[PDB]
Amino acid sequence: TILVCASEPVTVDGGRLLVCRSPGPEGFYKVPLGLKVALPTGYAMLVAQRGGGRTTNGIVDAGFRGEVQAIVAPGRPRAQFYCTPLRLAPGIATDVPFFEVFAPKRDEDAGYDIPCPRELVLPPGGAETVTLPVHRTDGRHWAYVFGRSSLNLRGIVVFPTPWESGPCRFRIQNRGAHPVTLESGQRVAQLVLTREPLGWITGRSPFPATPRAPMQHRPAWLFA
């Protein structure tokens, strides 16, 4: 059971929260969704757009008690936003010890921060493929590289990328106005482990919309 305090109308739709708001065409900036959630430990929540491509995928963790915001890129002025709770997995097997690559987190936190393995100078519009020296050794849960809120707000956009085979890889693109430098060791993304796959997440696009289909392990929402 997820607790939901809401200052504005919220639609519950196929297991996920749906909010209709009309941000401006500018970006990148934070679009308040009119609700707060209290996720139980072991849950996180994906925030993304319903049927459009101007929103960074966000991750709300179980310790977050502020208003939920969508962070959007420059785009068409109206938007619908989905929130999908994610049942977290404990870990995944890796050939290298897991915490020699990813940073330790709290049980309350959703994801494991990913330090940049090398300096990166992204000119405006520039993209780079970031690759980590670690492999998965089986397929018991799922794992996903997502951006970090701080970077998404700067228009430095990690492409939400699945990780089931090969090395941990993700694309990062600077949609900002100025060139950006990511220092080696800087926390540039996060790794989320899930009990159930996020089938739509492909790694090929900056702004993957969450599809309208309902989910399989739907939790309960309490509107208080």
Ligand X SMILES: O=c1ccn([C@H]2C[C@H](O)[C@@H](COP(=O)(O)O)O2)c(=O)[nH]1
How near is the Cβ of 53 to a second copy at its closest, in Å?
22
Q: Is 158 helix (H, G, I), strand (E, B) or coil?
A: strand
> Contact region for ligand X (CB under 6 A) — 10-18, 53-61, 124-132, 172-180?
53-61
Q: Which parts of 155-174 interact with ligand X (CB under 6 A)?
A: none
Instruction: Tell me which of 148, 156, 160, 180 binds Mg ion, using CB under 5 A.
Output: 148
Q: Which residue has the tokens 């990511």?
A: 182
216: Cα within 13 Å, side-chain hemisphere: 7
Here the tokens at position 51 are 């049927």
Cβ neighbour number for residue 31 with a 10 Å cutoff: 21
109: contact with ligand X by CB under 6 A: yes
> Using the rule CB under 6 A, is 60 a contact of ligand X?
yes
Q: Cβ closer to ligand X: 23 or 58? A: 58
Inter-residue contact 198 to 142 (CB < 8 Å): yes
**Chosen residue from 55, 80, 149, 174 binding ligand X by CB under 6 A:** 149
How far is Cα 60 from Cα 142, in angstroms, rounded to an integer?
18
Binding site for ligand X (CB under 6 A): 30, 58-61, 64, 69, 71, 109-111, 149, 190
